[PDB]
Amino acid sequence: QVQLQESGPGLVKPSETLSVTCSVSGDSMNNYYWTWIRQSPGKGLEWIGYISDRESATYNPSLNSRVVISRDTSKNQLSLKLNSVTPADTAVYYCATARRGQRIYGVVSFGEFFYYYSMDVWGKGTTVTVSSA
Amino acid sequence: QVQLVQSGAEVKKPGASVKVSCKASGYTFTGYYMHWVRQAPGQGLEWMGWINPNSGGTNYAQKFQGRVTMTRDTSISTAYMELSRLRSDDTAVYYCATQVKLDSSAGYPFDIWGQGTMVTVSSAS
Amino acid sequence: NITDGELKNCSFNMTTELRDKRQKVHALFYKLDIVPINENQNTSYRLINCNTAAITQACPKVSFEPIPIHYCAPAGFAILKCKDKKFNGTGPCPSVSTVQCTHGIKPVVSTQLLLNGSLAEEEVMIRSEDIRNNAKNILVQFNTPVQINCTRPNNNTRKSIRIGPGQWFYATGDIIGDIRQAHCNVSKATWNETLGKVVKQLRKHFGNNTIIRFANSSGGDLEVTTHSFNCGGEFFYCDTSGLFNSTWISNDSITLPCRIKQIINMWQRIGQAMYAPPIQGVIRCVSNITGLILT
Amino acid sequence: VRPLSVALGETARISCGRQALGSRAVQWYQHRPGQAPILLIYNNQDRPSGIPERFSGTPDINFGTRATLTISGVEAGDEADYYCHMWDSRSGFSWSFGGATRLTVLG
Ligand SMILES: *[C@@H]1O[C@H](CO)[C@@H](O[C@@H]2O[C@H](CO)[C@@H](O[C@@H]3O[C@H](CO[C@H]4O[C@H](CO[C@H]5O[C@H](CO)[C@@H](O)[C@H](O)[C@@H]5O[C@H]5O[C@H](CO)[C@@H](O)[C@H](O)[C@@H]5O)[C@@H](O)[C@H](OC5O[C@H](CO)[C@@H](O)[C@H](O)[C@@H]5O)[C@@H]4O)[C@@H](O)[C@H](O)[C@@H]3O)[C@H](O)[C@H]2NC(C)=O)[C@H](O)[C@H]1NC(C)=O
Ligand SMILES: *[C@@H]1O[C@H](CO)[C@@H](O[C@@H]2O[C@H](CO)[C@@H](O[C@H]3O[C@H](CO)[C@@H](O)[C@H](O)[C@@H]3O)[C@H](O)[C@H]2NC(C)=O)[C@H](O)[C@H]1NC(C)=O
Ligand SMILES: *[C@@H]1O[C@H](CO)[C@@H](OC2O[C@H](CO)[C@@H](O)[C@H](O)[C@H]2NC(C)=O)[C@H](O)[C@H]1NC(C)=O
Ligand SMILES: *[C@@H]1O[C@H](CO)[C@@H](O[C@@H]2O[C@H](CO)[C@@H](O)[C@H](O)[C@H]2NC(C)=O)[C@H](O)[C@H]1NC(C)=O
Ligand SMILES: *[C@@H]1O[C@H](CO)[C@@H](O[C@@H]2O[C@H](CO)[C@@H](O)[C@H](O)[C@H]2NC(C)=O)[C@H](O)[C@H]1NC(C)=O
Ligand SMILES: *[C@@H]1O[C@H](CO)[C@@H](O[C@H]2O[C@H](CO)[C@@H](O)[C@H](O)[C@H]2NC(C)=O)[C@H](O)[C@H]1NC(C)=O
Ligand SMILES: *[C@@H]1O[C@H](CO)[C@@H](O)[C@H](O)[C@H]1NC(C)=O
Ligand SMILES: *[C@@H]1O[C@H](CO)[C@@H](O)[C@H](O)[C@H]1NC(C)=O
Ligand SMILES: *[C@@H]1O[C@H](CO)[C@@H](O)[C@H](O)[C@H]1NC(C)=O
Ligand SMILES: *[C@@H]1O[C@H](CO)[C@@H](O)[C@H](O)[C@H]1NC(C)=O
Ligand SMILES: *[C@@H]1O[C@H](CO)[C@@H](O)[C@H](O)[C@H]1NC(C)=O
């Protein structure tokens, strides 16, 4: 029973910091994973990467690896930093949560399994439009 | 003639690996076992192990368990013996022996021997 | 493209019935039948046997399944069978019978572990030629067979290509399904009970109070270190280290991995190497392990 | 981007574009323009909390079949874009959601 509410600047010139924080309201976080989704008008959803308690920050091999995700336990917030932005990157950004499950078909002693993440609870999402004006 | 040649080795430093060879001729090489024995200067003999060149099945004593490796290249009828993580008390002479000719059928004892190679170590130069 | 592997897809040129045409075909090869040639450092592979010896295929119109074979003596000779329940290997035998000739025998090839043998009676048997010297393998025969199930869950496909006028060449064209390792299962409680029985029987030859320990193979080959056998038309090599890993003094089954080879060199010789055609579908072999061979 | 026009009262079935190879796990998502995407089915047989039991999943037994989401008893609320998410064993880690489909109702 958790709700996430994001806040961002919206209009920002290219090649500066774009930080959209999604504040949390509900129970404490101990096992759930978190994820950010980008959606551009005309294209589908963009699974950019997920965050965990192991300081793991992996992303798509085609996103040039220029965005970083961070979580502060003091303020209990989650933020993202994406530098060198392009005016053609206007999109809506959702901050949601997800859970990891495993699927076994062979023998566990040899590692015949694989993981998969499912985003159960979502957020609201706001649209950011970047340009030189 | 039934005989076994070896290759002399130089003094090695502690913590190094030695390479011992043993080449036979005459009789068929893939029919009988082959043992390895050591002799310390001024002491008695001590058995190291035995290798079967027919199938590569080896068996060595517990004094050298986990420190010696024995191989075989039957394409040229030669054997090998490796040994790393040396010490100072391993200064001795090594021999490779077979049992090519004897009335009895048991594996022991062996009669024919080879030239032999004396291997010794030195801490410094 | 399995991210971080047992088999690899290889593509190569091949002739045709027409002596001038050259086709390009691809197949799947296991990792134990391929050796690099460059090493500095690109990927250019070749087979293992045709550096030293030649190779012949085993056209699949015949089978390798063992069948009973009776050895029957000619007219003029006879066979004598001993029926003692304490035949320690050498010496007289009170109960002697004369039979026309023997019963069926299954000439099954195996290493480190007998298979489909003959069960003992009322006890386990521990035989050898000389026990007091370390130069003779010791035979052990159980009194109750242990069940063992080997399986390769892959789903292979036979792909046939032409190699010349009137010839054919089979290969594993594709694996459809889930890439997984072929394994073999053995019951745990029965194995521990059998090991207890055999050590209790072996204690008679080495003092009434001694420590008995087991260890895995020494090493130095791919045929007498692992457990090697054949079934369903395929040759397996299942590691047996997970069995002789105990120490004796005074429903949760065990699993064992298995590798598969194709270009074998069985019946040790020179100038010969037997290819094995792939079997289509899945393989499942149940066996009665009964014997043991221990240095 | 692929439309599918099915009138009211007809039971439609939409499948995923990219087929799978081996052990399979498919997830379904629905997205309306302006709203938030909500999942429909996960693990190919499980039903989440807060969904009518009218969307029957595709059980994956005796591999050789395909994945397809059906709609039984369509209403005014079941008209949006659909997304299929594939996870298998012989492809590694899937990142993109792939192509999507759009459903339209008649009458
Ligand atoms: C040689 O021996 C080896 C040694 O065992 C043999 O190896 C095994 O091989 C079998 C088959 O080859 C293999 O089974 C495979 O297992 C998978 C997974 O099974 C697991 O999960 C399902 C579903 O579940 C989840 O949901 C239930 C209900 O809600 C929960 O109770 C459960 O805990 C699971 O929750 C998990 O997921 C949640 C997310 O959904 C997560 O939040 C949780 O935290 C959990 O992680 C189970 O149904 C299944 O179990 C079952 O066993 C029951 C008792 O026998 C039966 O009623 C049913 O089968 C029941 O499903 C299991 O727990 C299956 O999906 C495959 O179908 C397959 O069976 C097994 O993993 C291997 N390993 C072991 C240790 O057994 C080998 O086969 C053998 N070979 C030969 C040739 O002899
Ligand atoms: C030890 O003896 C076993 C006999 O119980 C033997 O198992 C049999 O092996 C065959 C070989 O493929 C299996 O398949 C055979 O039987 C099926 C029956 O449908 C036929 O379709 C096949 O063509 C083939 O003839 C058997 O399933 C299997 N079990 C039995 C009960 O027959 C083991 O293979 C023997 N061990 C070794 C190492 O050979
Ligand atoms: C190995 O893969 C085969 C190809 O998919 C598969 O074969 C068939 O079986 C399915 C399941 O019943 C049928 O739907 C299909 O028509 C069959 N096709 C042919 C050509 O036979 C095998 O079943 C798979 N192996 C195993 C053990 O399932
Ligand atoms: C080994 O390589 C061959 C050729 O590169 C693969 O064969 C083709 O497989 C690809 C899959 O990436 C298909 O797109 C092609 O249509 C296939 N045929 C041809 C003529 O290219 C083969 O699949 C590879 N092996 C494995 C196990 O993936
Ligand atoms: C090897 O395979 C046989 C054949 O399936 C297994 O035997 C059976 O055991 C299962 C469960 O233990 C029973 O459901 C079957 O009814 C049994 N059948 C027979 C003919 O006995 C055997 O358990 C397998 N071995 C191991 C170690 O699991
Ligand atoms: C037999 O069992 C021993 C038990 O460990 C295996 O041991 C070792 O060798 C491995 C690789 O050579 C090392 O990774 C291990 O650390 C090492 N362990 C010990 C205790 O020495 C050995 O490999 C097994 N032999 C075979 C042929 O499987
Ligand atoms: C053999 O001669 C023919 C003559 O047309 C020529 O086309 C062919 O190329 C020659 N052989 C080959 C295989 O090149
Ligand atoms: C056949 O050989 C030529 C050159 O020797 C090579 O370019 C070609 O790729 C080979 N065929 C295949 C299918 O690889
Ligand atoms: C079998 O018993 C005889 C009778 O004394 C004995 O001479 C022989 O050594 C024994 N052999 C074994 C293998 O026990
Ligand atoms: C052998 O037994 C020991 C006992 O603890 C265990 O740690 C080890 O993993 C076992 N070896 C194998 C290969 O299972
Ligand atoms: C294996 O043992 C069981 C139980 O005694 C027996 O029924 C079966 O026939 C045996 N297998 C063979 C191949 O004899």
mmCIF file of C-alpha atoms and ligand atoms in Angstrom, chain C residues 216-218 239 241, ligand 6:
data_model
loop_
_atom_site.group_PDB
_atom_site.id
_atom_site.type_symbol
_atom_site.label_atom_id
_atom_site.label_comp_id
_atom_site.label_asym_id
_atom_site.label_seq_id
_atom_site.Cartn_x
_atom_site.Cartn_y
_atom_site.Cartn_z
ATOM 1 C CA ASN C 216 38.018 -39.842 -5.828
ATOM 2 C CA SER C 217 40.098 -40.936 -8.808
ATOM 3 C CA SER C 218 43.730 -39.889 -9.105
ATOM 4 C CA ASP C 239 31.910 -37.855 -12.760
ATOM 5 C CA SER C 241 33.523 -37.903 -7.128
HETATM 6 C C1 LIG E 6 39.064 -35.018 -5.999
HETATM 7 O O1 LIG E 6 38.532 -34.342 -4.858
HETATM 8 C C2 LIG E 6 39.334 -33.240 -4.410
HETATM 9 C C3 LIG E 6 38.685 -32.715 -3.151
HETATM 10 O O2 LIG E 6 38.822 -31.305 -3.047
HETATM 11 C C4 LIG E 6 39.433 -32.193 -5.514
HETATM 12 O O3 LIG E 6 40.291 -31.141 -5.088
HETATM 13 C C5 LIG E 6 40.994 -29.988 -5.344
HETATM 14 O O4 LIG E 6 41.392 -29.614 -6.667
HETATM 15 C C6 LIG E 6 40.587 -28.575 -7.242
HETATM 16 C C7 LIG E 6 41.077 -28.375 -8.657
HETATM 17 O O5 LIG E 6 42.187 -29.213 -8.944
HETATM 18 C C8 LIG E 6 40.686 -27.312 -6.392
HETATM 19 O O6 LIG E 6 39.828 -26.314 -6.931
HETATM 20 C C9 LIG E 6 40.294 -27.616 -4.952
HETATM 21 O O7 LIG E 6 40.507 -26.470 -4.136
HETATM 22 C C10 LIG E 6 41.113 -28.784 -4.413
HETATM 23 N N1 LIG E 6 40.690 -29.125 -3.064
HETATM 24 C C11 LIG E 6 41.495 -29.711 -2.172
HETATM 25 C C12 LIG E 6 40.894 -29.990 -0.827
HETATM 26 O O8 LIG E 6 42.657 -30.001 -2.438
HETATM 27 C C13 LIG E 6 39.978 -32.823 -6.788
HETATM 28 O O9 LIG E 6 39.941 -31.878 -7.851
HETATM 29 C C14 LIG E 6 39.155 -34.048 -7.175
HETATM 30 N N2 LIG E 6 39.728 -34.698 -8.342
HETATM 31 C C15 LIG E 6 39.026 -34.965 -9.447
HETATM 32 C C16 LIG E 6 39.777 -35.638 -10.555
HETATM 33 O O10 LIG E 6 37.840 -34.676 -9.548
#
